[PDB]
Amino acid sequence: LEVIIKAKVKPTEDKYKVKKAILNIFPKAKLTFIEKDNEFGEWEGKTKSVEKLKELLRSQSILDAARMVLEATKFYLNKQAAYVGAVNFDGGIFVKILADENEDIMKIIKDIAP
Amino acid sequence: LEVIIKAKVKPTEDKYKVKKAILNIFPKAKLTFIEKDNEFGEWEGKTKSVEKLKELLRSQSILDAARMVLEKGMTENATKFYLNKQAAYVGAVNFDIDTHGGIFVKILADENEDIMKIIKDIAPRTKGGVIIN
8 A cells, every 4th residue: 555645735825734634634644845836835745554544434434435435546635624634525635545566456445445 | 985805714724824815905904804613714804995906907917807807796886706815815816716715805886986987997998908098
């Protein structure tokens, strides 16, 4: 498992509130911020742990909802929900879980969203 | 004339940056911040001056766009439209709602003002980028 995280930071945003939103869901992520033109910016991170995510889908009873969005895999989490510690699917936090050559993404999907 | 302004502040936004985006377009606005749910908030305020807005439309040379947007949101004694919050942050006027909500603007004409005259005054027609009346 390798998790690729990307989040944009608009001029009116607090880069660190965005960072916190990410970590709330992927606490293990190694994140770096890239500056851009006209006050825009972005966070690019990576992590190998989907534990907090799993813990939230369960603790929030949305395993099936997640299962559906997941079916490597890429999806978007709602930044504002992630900020208050919640997992939500409806730019957002770009997430891409990619199973190494010797794994099946589906099996990863079932371990994450039973 | 009277301008009503409302701008949401999302959880990951810095309320002071949203407030400055408003002031960059409406310098005289009196603003108040109210808290909502799940870390959301909102700025509300008013001003009787559209002087800065008028300068920016001329400076950016986007009178033609402004005129169309103002007429489209026009009613009997008012007109409304949104401003891009990110463009506003850097001192620019843009009418597309940004990913974060934009700034909702309502210009109200008083009983002795004609709303269409307010609009012609703010965003006058042009012929070659040069104002008419």
